[PDB]
Structures are given as structure tokens and as C-alpha cells.
Amino acid sequence: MAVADLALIPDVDIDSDGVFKYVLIRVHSAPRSGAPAAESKEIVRGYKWAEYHADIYDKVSGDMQKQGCDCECLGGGRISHQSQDKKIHVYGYSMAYGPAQHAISTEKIKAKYPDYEVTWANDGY
């Protein structure tokens, strides 16, 4: 046995090399289905293999629930960093789950990669 804690869960983990979908997932203190805490946390996941936002939500919340944690996607979007300005960018929406709070994503991705900067604008697709 082991028991996670919301601080131990990776805050951002992604596999990025172009344009690919991501989801914002709220996570709650339910490790072992018996952790005494009742906090909440958010994670940023997104990978080129998740051609649809449901793919990451099913995989990731499956892993969270295997640790014990209970979850809800706040929404989906996509991460890109193409442009002519290397600022990573977060935008778009899921159709099953709507637009995420891309605000949370940028502050987390900036903190993960302080050598770079990140922006969002919900105007895109």
C-alpha cells in the first residue's frame, strides 16, 4: 500500500511537440478512499496521443481514482507554441466538456517552465 497527497501529484505533465489537446482536471482529497484531508487541487494534462479530450479525462481520472483521488474535468482546450513568438498558448474548447479555465493552465505552465512565458485567448478553436 501507499497513499498519495495532492502535493505529490504532478501539477503539470504534458508531452508537447506542436499542436495537441489538453484538459484541466480538478482533483480532491480522496487517496485510499480514506485520506482524512478534504482539500482540492487542479492538474494540467495534454498529449499528442489524446486526439479527443475524453481520452485524457478517462486515462487521467482512471489513474487518479486508482490512487483514490476523485476528479472532474473543468473543461478542455489545446496547447500550441507555433506562431512567430515562442510564448506557449492555451485556447479552444472540448465539445463534451466545454472550454477550461485557461487562466489556471497558464499560471501553472508558467510556473513549470519559468524560462518561457505562456498566454491564453479563448477566441480560437
What is the domain-level CATH number for residue 81? 3.50.20.20
Identify whether 102 is a catalytic site residue.
Answer: no
User: Could you tell me the three cell numbers for 88?
Assistant: 506557449
User: Could you tell me the three cell numbers for 107?
Assistant: 499560471
Annotated binding site: 21, 94-96
Residue 95, burial from CB neighbour count under 10 angstroms (0-12, 13-18, 19+): exposed
Residue 23, burial from CB neighbour count under 10 angstroms (0-12, 13-18, 19+): buried
Question: Range of 73's domain?
Answer: 5-125
73-92 residues labelled b (16+ CB within 10 A) or e (exposed):
bbbbbbbbbeeeeeebbbbb
> 90 — alpha (psi -120 to 50), left (phi > 0) or beta?
beta
Contact call for residues 65 and 46 (beta carbons, < 8 A)? no
Distance (Å) of CA 33 to CA 19, 28, 39, 119: 36, 11, 14, 36
How wide is the angle at C-alpha 48 spanned by C-alphas 47 and 54, nearest 5°?
Answer: 65
User: Could you tell me the three cell numbers for 32?
Assistant: 485510499
Annotated binding site for substrate: 21, 94-96
d(CA 92, CA 120): 9
The count of structural domains within the chain is 1
Name, in order, each residue with C-beta under 8 angstroms of 55's C-beta and a sequence gap of 6 or more.
Answer: 49
